[model samples]
Target chain A: ALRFEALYPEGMCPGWSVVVKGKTSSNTSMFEINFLSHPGDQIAFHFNPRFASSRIVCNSFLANHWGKEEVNKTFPFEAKEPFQVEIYSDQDYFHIFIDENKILQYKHRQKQLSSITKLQILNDIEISSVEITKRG
Target chain B: ALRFEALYPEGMCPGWSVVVKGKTSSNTSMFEINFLSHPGDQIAFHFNPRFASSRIVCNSFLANHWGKEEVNKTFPFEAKEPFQVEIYSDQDYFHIFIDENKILQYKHRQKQLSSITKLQILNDIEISSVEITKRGLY
Candidate 1:
């Protein structure tokens, strides 16, 4: 069973860092992320700050269906506790933290003992948490 | 029962005049006018004479849905005698003027009225008489 929720208030843009273990940092892949303006909001991504220029990409077209996926992934990201995550579009100027499952799957698919993993940002949503996963 | 039997031979168009008697021409009203054309022919209207610029529209779009009461309309013009009907459009326009009894209501409903009713000129075949009538409560 998975309990899902958003960390930031609905319609509010998520930013820089998530507080975990009471430590602050510029980079951490503690969770996979996506931006959601609110419940039933079309999935969108921020390409830059100010949220002016952005792109909304959807797989709903391929599915021959309308609307976004209900909840994506084997694991769901939950904000029940403090967790740190963030990502940057430009090199070093910002860092987009990989969500837990994507990070693991991305790394596992790549097959590296311990290597720097980079995830492709599909659209302007830039880097933001879409959902948080909770594991018992 | 309603006579229901009628013939429309003049090609339908946005501005072409229909000769059928006993019906009023209102924009809100539509008619299921039927005509014939070849594959790859263009059909349009000559809005102005000196301009020589005719509104060349596709005849295929007109034949696209020709059988439903909603999609088809009685050709408005009077067909005092039989006349050959022909329409032109881009290459690949082929259609046959459908007899009134042959129209399929289900298929006609799927096509738009304007797209299917326009002026069409016939060529080669000798033909005659145009007819038209109302389908529902006018």
Candidate 2:
């Protein structure tokens, strides 16, 4: 059974890694992976990949306002391709990698990183698994 | 974590019971409990409780068509109230009980009872627990 959302009951912190394994739908145009302070509050990190536009958009939302979006020109994803994406945080940034190849580093926008207590996977994706851990 | 949909891995048959414990949203207008043959296929049974209309609707869907609806006049549900609803099947009908009180009986529309593989709870409700079994507080 795939869970659509993850709750960090003890709160998220630096040195933590969130591993998501999923496949994009053939008919999908886009999808989002969001790290949030709460279910309805700030989206500390918003990672969106658009197949239609062939670009990845990364941004943050705070104080009910969206900050300037960061776009990456590389599109490594394909329709119906199973992927294992890793996202980990240090004190300064949230780093992303796919198949151990570096994707991008999103600079920390919400300084109180521990408040990012939930992870949600949305739209046009089939989740096989989601794992969160702190190795260090 | 509690599931909002119960997948009857063994496929449902007589004596199987689905118990759902949840609370209605105060601002909710309605909610539904649906039994299906498959996710995209027929809705074998659709049970809807509408707070606005003060009635409980029960019906079946087959072959891309909805059968005539049967409604219960007694409304045992309340806004924001926690409720434990139990639905079980026998040879002839699907019987419903709330708090062990008999609510309604819907006669079997689709005779192949073993084909009901999924139970879904939807709309305007916060589920606390969902349990399915052949042995229960029947």
Candidate 3:
């Protein structure tokens, strides 16, 4: 099973994103998927003022809003192996499964800049081998 | 060192999402990145409809009109790639890049619920060494 589907209808509205399916494999919380997702169903863009102000507000909210507070309690960029974001529209819910924590340390140090002073949701998230359990 | 920092005023628009820097380093047209995005700065919910008629509607203007014929193009899925969406609110625009060839592959076999739905924006997109010319522009 893959996260991206290509059969999605054209144009937009909140229907399933137009995506293309390809090979999908996973281990632990990490996965390696190849597919396509529609424009809106895939991502949107946002921006704000000042770096310091953004972090403070964003961090605290992420720590509280989505039950990812556990992420903060264990913070300082916890990779915790491979993590997975299971978005279930059937229930209108999104759940994050954190597996290996240390694997993400490398990401904390990538030198990249966006075109603007805003938050860019890297919707193209792929997980590789880490660990996997059927339990929620 | 990074693009797009998420700073909030009073924790309202909390969390940060950043796109990676560099173009040649990324493998596909898709870019990759690592981010700690806030659910508050944005909100995303799923809409499940049993049939095409049941599909929920957002403003029609939100996206391009449906069923518009177009030329084949390349589309990239990796979130960190240069062609991916970049929120330049100051300019009030977001960029979308895709590999038409890659998308066509998906379209060919996209049907069948049992079909694998693979849509990923790969992080750690590898890049080989690049040297800038003395002229300043590549």
Candidate 4:
């Protein structure tokens, strides 16, 4: 069971980002990273991994606001393999890089970047290090 | 790198299956199995494994038309790993099984399945045994 939550007390902006390092456990079929809107369960960004099928699924959640789910076939994470992920936010998209490769460039559905103040990495991943960084 | 091309004097039909057993060579980037349209270069079905990208690109080639390239993410073969691949063709689709797991279901692009008079396996894989079989009843 992988459940870790980190709060962005100052809120996330265009230049803000979080880098996660770890590997997926063997027998782990799926895992998700939820960029949560503070004070509620609304998801600003949702990134899920399906190792068995070798694919990645992305979507978002908000009240009365529907988000389209995107499925990309490019998979960089393998079972029990180490990976470094940087979830970066720019002016338009949530750029995800895995192991130094540009993997997914998910466009922003919920435009209020600062409102996504919590990041929760839930299920199947073995967390090693999570650090916050910003642009100067 | 093993290449095998077998001629079917009588074309393959529904309920026909080919079981291929082999190991992928080290550093092999891609391998393809083409169900060829006889007396020419037309491909009834094209199954390819893109190793570096972990993608399987499937399509049909020629009708004086090039069919759509099917994109799929399921990849079971790895370099230097032994595998058993079963390619079964029916009236509608080509079913692929890797290690006995149903990995692909590609619908037939060209309707005349019996016109596929030759089978070709090209690049990157070593084939130990490939046997043709048929269904019990019609």
Q: For all candidates, what are the clash counts?
A: 67, 0, 53, 0
**Cα lDDT of all candidates, in order?**
0.24, 0.75, 0.20, 0.74
* Per-residue lDDT value at B109 in model 2: 93
Per-model root-mean-square deviation over C-alphas: 25.8, 12.2, 20.1, 21.9
Candidate 1 residue-wise lDDT, B1-138, digit = tens:
111111122222222222211221232322222332323222222110011121112222333442211223334222232322322222222222332222221222212233433222122111122222121211
| Every prediction: chain A TM-score | 0.24, 0.92, 0.23, 0.91
lDDT of 4 by residue, B13-62 (tens): 55667777777775548888888776685888888888888888999888
**Candidate 4 lDDT, A20-134, residue by residue in tens:** 7767877447788878785676888889988878889999988846488899888888898878888888879889999888898888887887777667777777665454555
lDDT digits (tens) for residues A45-119 of candidate 1: 221111121111222211223444332222222323333333322212222343322221111111121121111
Candidate 3 has an lDDT of: 0.20
Q: What is the C-alpha lDDT profile of model 3 across B1-138, one tens digit per residue? A: 221122221121111111222333433322322111232211111111111132211111112222222222332433344332221111121112223121221111111211111111232333211111011111
Weakest 10 consecutive residues of candidate 2 chain A by summed lDDT: A1-10
Residue pairs clashing in model 2 are none
Interface RMSD of each: 32.8, 11.2, 18.1, 27.5
Q: Write the per-residue lDDT of candidate 2 for residues B1-138, one digit (tens) a residue.
A: 212454443456567777767777654478888888854648888888998888999999998999999999898998888888888888898899987799999998977777887676777766654555454322
- Ranked by DockQ, the better of candidates 1 and 3 is 3
Per-prediction DockQ: 0.01, 0.03, 0.02, 0.01
Task: Give the Cα-based TM-score of candidate 4 against the true structure.
Answer: 0.48
Misplaced by over 4 Å in model 4 are A1-136
Q: Residues A28-111, candidate 2, lDDT per residue (tens digit)?
A: 477888888854668999988888877889999888999999999888888788877788899999999876789999999998
How well does candidate 4 score on lDDT at residue A54?
Answer: 83
